[PDB]
Amino acid sequence: GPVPSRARVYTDVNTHRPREYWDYESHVVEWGNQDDYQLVRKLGRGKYSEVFEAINITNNEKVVVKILKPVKKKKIKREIKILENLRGGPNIITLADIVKDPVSRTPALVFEHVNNTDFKQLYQTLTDYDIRFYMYEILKALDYCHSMGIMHRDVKPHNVMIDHEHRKLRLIDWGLAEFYHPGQEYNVRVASRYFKGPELLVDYQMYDYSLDMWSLGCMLASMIFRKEPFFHGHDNYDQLVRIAKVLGTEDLYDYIDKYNIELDPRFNDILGRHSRKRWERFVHSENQHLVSPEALDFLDKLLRYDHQSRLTAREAMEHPYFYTVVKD
Ligand SMILES: Cc1cc(O)c2c(c1)C(=O)c1cc(O)cc(O)c1C2=O
């Protein structure tokens, strides 16, 4: 059966912690007062929640209220415990309160207000500098959560809220996030298609923080090449094909061979044989101002099949691509 894997960083951060930290099932929700929040405008609805702009009438402050759909008790407390564990971390959305919505009969999570513009709204028109700036901002969030024993598992532009006026970013929607426990098998049905890492797509369950670094790489590629999304699969199978047309099939074989796993036989008729491409082939007159050798080397080091060989968040922050970004 499959060869086991472990994160190369923050491997044992949870094993050491008190039960209370990661055992979200035992978490006791502290409830605030639902009457403090008045919904103003519905902003979105997803599989797991409806999202509102609201106002907190105890301070007159705008907030964002997320009213959870019924799903699995356990998922609610997981997201809650994660948010409280991460609260105050860099670029992590701040859970301000948790109230019981009297209509839905479910928890409503109250977040700090963020401008109603996701990253996908502007990330195809940022300058080279701004891409590097915002990527470093994302990396701060991801190294923070990974250092706290947590993988986001749904990194994508919709989950990065950007207030470009204020050059401020928050990583949101922690409802798929999970505690990393060495040796634990996880559900591969996480992340959105275009951002799923190869480990998800080959059903390798013993994955870790590095899943998020694949997702980040897909964001990077789509920004610097101005191609949204960068790996544009029609489904989860073609999604792997799309990656193999860039990263080549021999390295895909080397990856699954290293972990002693087998592709779905469904790939026999669709995968073909593909050489690894040089990143230069995605450069053209319209995106060349966004591409530099550093950008390409950084991207190359994120988009690796072998989740063990991807830059970690902290390594990525060390990369020369960020030398041009002014650090606070
Ligand atoms: C259209 C839209 C606008 C938003 O401001 C948010 C969201 C969606 C959203 O899904 C969201 C999820 C979350 O877990 C925290 C948030 O602050 C949010 C949001 O803030």
Side-chain angles (χ1 to χ4, degrees):
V3 165
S5 177
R6 304 250 173 318
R8 286 173 79 169
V9 291
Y10 308 126
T11 314
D12 312 312
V13 298
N14 292 316
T15 86
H16 287 292
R17 295 256 185 201
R19 216 102 208 170
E20 73 219 53
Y21 189 87
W22 48 257
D23 166 36
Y24 57 85
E25 288 146 296
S26 284
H27 184 67
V28 170
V29 174
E30 286 182 357
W31 300 101
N33 295 143
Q34 189 275 338
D35 26 69
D36 294 347
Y37 310 99
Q38 304 192 315
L39 312 175
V40 164
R41 193 163 67 101
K42 184 165 60 191
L43 302 170
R45 185 197 274 146
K47 205 180 162 57
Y48 294 117
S49 84
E50 300 206 309
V51 175
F52 300 85
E53 172 187 346
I55 168 175
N56 177 335
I57 71 166
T58 68
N59 53 31
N60 214 4
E61 278 180 285
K62 298 193 185 173
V63 292
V64 170
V65 172
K66 177 173 139 162
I67 297 175
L68 301 183
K69 295 195 185 181
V71 181
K72 246 89 230 286
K73 308 250 190 335
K74 220 182 63 179
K75 195 148 132 139
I76 288 156
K77 282 198 198 186
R78 184 171 80 186
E79 176 174 5
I80 285 166
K81 189 59 183 164
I82 293 187
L83 291 159
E84 300 188 348
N85 287 351
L86 306 173
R87 187 155 45 203
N91 294 340
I92 305 299
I93 195 69
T94 297
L95 180 64
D97 210 346
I98 308 170
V99 300
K100 293 170 80 57
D101 187 75
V103 174
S104 68
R105 315 176 53 79
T106 62
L109 307 185
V110 185
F111 299 99
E112 56 173 304
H113 187 248
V114 285
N115 204 57
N116 180 208
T117 168
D118 64 44
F119 200 50
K120 206 177 192 295
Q121 273 351 267
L122 77 334
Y123 85 139
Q124 294 295 298
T125 71
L126 300 168
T127 63
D128 173 44
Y129 186 81
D130 280 358
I131 301 168
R132 308 189 194 212
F133 179 79
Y134 288 121
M135 280 284 294
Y136 195 74
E137 290 308 311
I138 304 162
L139 275 172
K140 291 184 196 163
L142 286 176
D143 187 49
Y144 189 73
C145 70
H146 297 169
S147 73
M148 296 290 283
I150 292 159
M151 45 189 170
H152 183 278
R153 311 199 296 180
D154 197 15
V155 177
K156 57 176 176 177
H158 276 307
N159 291 333
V160 181
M161 293 293 289
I162 297 282
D163 179 333
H164 190 41
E165 174 159 12
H166 297 89
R167 303 193 61 87
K168 209 162 56 142
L169 184 133
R170 295 289 187 271
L171 176 58
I172 60 153
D173 209 342
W174 297 79
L176 285 185
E178 235 315 356
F179 293 92
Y180 179 64
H181 282 113
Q184 185 163 130
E185 292 188 328
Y186 292 95
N187 182 2
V188 298
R189 299 180 112 247
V190 295
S192 300
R193 188 180 319 129
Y194 307 137
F195 298 93
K196 287 170 187 292
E199 55 274 55
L200 309 181
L201 301 172
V202 300
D203 293 304
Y204 186 75
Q205 292 183 254
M206 202 176 293
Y207 63 78
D208 64 64
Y209 318 116
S210 56
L211 173 62
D212 289 335
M213 295 312 291
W214 176 275
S215 304
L216 184 79
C218 292
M219 298 184 42
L220 181 62
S222 165
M223 297 187 274
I224 71 179
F225 294 134
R226 291 267 190 96
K227 174 178 190 301
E228 184 175 34
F230 185 69
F231 294 123
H232 196 167
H234 71 74
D235 59 31
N236 294 340
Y237 306 110
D238 184 54
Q239 181 68 23
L240 190 59
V241 184
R242 295 307 173 120
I243 290 167
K245 286 190 183 169
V246 174
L247 288 197
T249 50
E250 287 287 351
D251 291 321
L252 168 64
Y253 283 106
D254 283 347
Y255 174 51
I256 71 177
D257 285 358
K258 168 167 174 194
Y259 295 96
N260 286 17
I261 63 216
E262 198 152 41
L263 293 177
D264 186 331
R266 213 187 285 258
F267 283 106
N268 297 156
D269 296 340
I270 60 175
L271 181 59
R273 290 199 291 171
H274 299 291
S275 61
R276 181 139 207 159
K277 307 307 182 300
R278 314 187 105 110
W279 293 102
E280 292 84 354
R281 59 140 52 189
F282 301 101
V283 182
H284 48 68
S285 63
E286 287 69 51
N287 64 23
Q288 66 186 38
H289 64 109
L290 299 181
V291 176
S292 57
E294 293 78 10
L296 297 182
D297 178 64
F298 173 44
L299 185 63
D300 194 48
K301 287 173 160 48
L302 297 175
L303 291 185
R304 322 294 312 177
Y305 290 119
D306 192 346
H307 52 278
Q308 287 180 10
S309 81
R310 298 174 198 149
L311 293 181
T312 63
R314 183 74 85 113
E315 294 184 297
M317 286 172 87
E318 297 289 293
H319 192 281
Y321 182 60
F322 299 108
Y323 292 167
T324 195
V325 175
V326 173
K327 298 324 171 316
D328 303 315

